[PDB]
Amino acid sequence: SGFRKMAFPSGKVEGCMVQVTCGTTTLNGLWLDDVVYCPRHVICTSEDMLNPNYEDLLIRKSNHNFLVQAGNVQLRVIGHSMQNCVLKLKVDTANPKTPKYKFVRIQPGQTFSVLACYNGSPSGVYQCAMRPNFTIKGSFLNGSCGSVGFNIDYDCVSFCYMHHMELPTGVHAGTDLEGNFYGPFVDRQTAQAAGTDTTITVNVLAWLYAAVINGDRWFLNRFTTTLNDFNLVAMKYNYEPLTQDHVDILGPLSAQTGIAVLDMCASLKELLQNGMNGRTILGSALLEDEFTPFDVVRQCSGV
Residues that bind ligand I54 (CB under 6 A): 1, 27, 41, 44, 49, 140-145, 164-166, 172, 187-189
Nearest to 22 by CA among 43, 38, 1: 43
Cβ-proximal residue to ligand I54, closest one: 145
> In the complex, what is the shortest distance from the CB of residue 253 to a second copy, in angstroms, rounded to a whole number?
16
Contacted by 298, from a second copy, ligand I54, none: CB < 5 to 8 Å by type: a second copy
> In the complex, what is the shortest distance from the CB of residue 124 to a second copy, in angstroms, rounded to a whole number?
4
Look at phi and psi of residue 18 and say left if phi exceeds 0, alpha if psi is from -120 to 50, else beta.
Answer: beta
5 contributes a contact to a second copy by CB under 8 A: yes
Contacted by 126, from ligand I54, a second copy, none: CB < 5 to 8 Å by type: a second copy
301 contributes a contact to a second copy by CB under 8 A: yes
> In the complex, what is the shortest distance from the CB of residue 172 to a second copy, in angstroms, rounded to a whole number?
7
Residues 125-184 within binding reach of a second copy (CB under 8 A): 125-126, 137-142, 166, 170-172
Count the neighbouring beta carbons within 10 Å of the beta carbon of residue 234: 19
Task: Say if residue 153 is exposed, middle or buried (CB neighbours under 10 Å; 0-12, 13-18, 19+).
Answer: exposed
Q: Which is nearer to a second copy, 81 or 169 (CB)?
A: 169
Q: In this structure, is the dihedral angle defined by the CA atoms of residues 190, 193, 194 and 195, taken in order, positive or negative?
A: negative
Helix (H) or strand (E) holding 32: strand 25-32
Which range of residues in 3-11, 18-26, 43-51, 260-268 is near a second copy by CB under 8 A? Answer: 3-11
- The single residue among 214, 224, 227, 270 that binds a second copy, judged by CB under 8 A, is 214
Q: Which is nearer to ligand I54, 1 or 228 (CB)?
A: 1
Which range of residues in 82-90, 118-126, 187-195, 229-237 is near a second copy by CB under 8 A? Answer: 118-126
Nearest to 42 by CA among 179, 159, 183, 193: 179
Contact 19, 77 (CB under 8 A): no
Burial 278-296 (b: 16+ CB within 10 A, else e): eeebbeeeebbbbbbbebb
* Close Cβ partners of 245 (under 8 Å, ≥ 6 residues apart): none
Count the neighbouring beta carbons within 10 Å of the beta carbon of residue 102: 13
How many residues sit close enough to a second copy to count as binding (CB under 8 A)? 43
106 contributes a contact to a second copy by CB under 8 A: no
Q: Active-site residues: which are they?
A: 41, 145
Total number of residues shown for the chain:
303
* Footprint on this chain of a second copy (rule: CB under 8 A): 1-12, 14-15, 115-116, 122-126, 137-142, 166, 170-172, 214-215, 280, 283-286, 298-299, 301-303
